C-alpha cells in the first residue's frame, strides 16, 4: 500500500489528546471523551504531494502501547496552556520516549493546546524555551477551534521524514 506514519500522541490526562485527534479525523470538537480509552485511528492525508496513511495512537493513563512506543515513528508531546502541571510533566514523557528509543534524536513536536481559553498559565516563551532545549518545534493548538491542529500533525510527519527515508 501507500506510505504510512506511526504517530503517538502523549501527555497528561485532560490536555486534549483525544480532542486533537478527533479533530484531525472527524473535523469537529468533542466536549467529553472517556479519558480511559486508549485506541488507534487511521487518516488518509496528502502532505507535500504524498498520499500518506497516518496511524495514530491516542494514549490514556500509564498503568498495544508498549509496541507503539517501541515502534512509534514520531510523537506529539501535548500539554494544555492552562495546565501548569501538564507542562511540567512533559519532561517525563520525553524521557520515556528517549529511554525506549535509546536515542536523543526522536521525531517529536511540542504541542500547547487549549489556546482558545483565556488567561494561560503557561506562556509561549516558556513553551518555546522548552522546545528549543529539546531541539524540536513548538506548535500552539486549539482542538475547539482547530487552530494549529493540522500544523501539529503535518509538522510531525515532516520531522519523521527529516529523520528517516519514507
Ligand X SMILES: *CCC(=O)N1CC[C@@H](O)[C@H]1C(=O)Nc1ccc2cc(Br)ccc2c1
Ligand Y SMILES: Nc1nc2c(ncn2[C@@H]2O[C@H](COP(=O)(O)OP(=O)(O)O)[C@@H](O)[C@H]2O)c(=O)[nH]1
Closer to ligand X at the Cβ: 83 or 155?
83
Calpha distance 127→50 (Å, rounded): 30
Among the listed residues 83, 113, 115, 142, the single contact to ligand X using CB under 6 A: 83
Q: Does 101 bind ligand X (CB under 6 A)?
A: no
Which range of residues in 9-17, 69-77, 80-88, 152-160 is near Mg ion by CB under 5 A? 9-17
CB atoms within 10 A of CB 127: 21
Restricted to residues 25-54, the positions that interact with ligand Y (CB under 6 A) are 30-33, 35
Q: Does 120 bind ligand Y (CB under 6 A)?
A: no
Q: What angle, 0 to 180 degrees and rounded to 10, lies between the N-to-C axes of helices 149-163 and 17-26?
A: 90
Q: Does 59 bind ligand X (CB under 6 A)?
A: no
Q: Which three cell numbers stand for residue 85?
A: 502541571
Calpha distance 19→105 (Å, rounded): 27
Which of 113, 121, 96 minimizes the C-alpha distance to 149?
113
CB under 5 to 8 A by kind: which of ligand Y, ligand X, Mg ion, none does 52 bind? Answer: none
Amino acid at each position: 500500500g501507500m506510505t504510512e506514519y506511526k504517530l503517538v500522541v502523549v501527555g497528561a490526562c485532560g490536555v486534549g489528546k483525544s480532542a486533537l485527534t478527533i479533530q484531525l479525523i472527524q473535523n469537529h470538537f468533542v466536549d467529553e471523551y472517556d479519558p480511559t480509552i486508549e485506541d488507534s485511528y487511521r487518516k488518509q492525508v496528502v502532505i507535500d504531494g504524498e498520499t500518506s496513511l497516518l496511524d495514530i495512537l491516542d494514549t490514556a493513563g500509564q498503568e498495544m502501547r508498549d509496541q507503539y512506543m517501541r515502534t512509534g515513528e514520531g510523537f506529539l508531546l501535548v500539554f494544555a496552556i492552562n495546565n501548569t502541571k501538564s507542562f511540567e510533566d512533559i519532561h517525563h514523557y520525553r524521557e520515556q520516549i528517549k529511554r525506549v528509543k535509546d536515542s536523543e534524536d526522536v521525531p517529536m513536536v511540542l504541542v500547547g493546546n487549549k489556546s482558545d481559553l483565556p488567561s494561560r498559565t503557561v506562556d509561549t516563551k516558556q513553551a518555546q524555551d522548552l522546545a528549543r532545549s529539546y531541539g524540536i518545534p513548538f506548535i500552539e493548538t486549539s482542538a475547539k477551534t482547530r487552530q494549529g491542529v493540522d500544523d501539529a500533525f503535518y509538522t510531525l510527519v515532516r520531522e519523521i521524514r527529516k529523520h528517516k527515508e519514507k
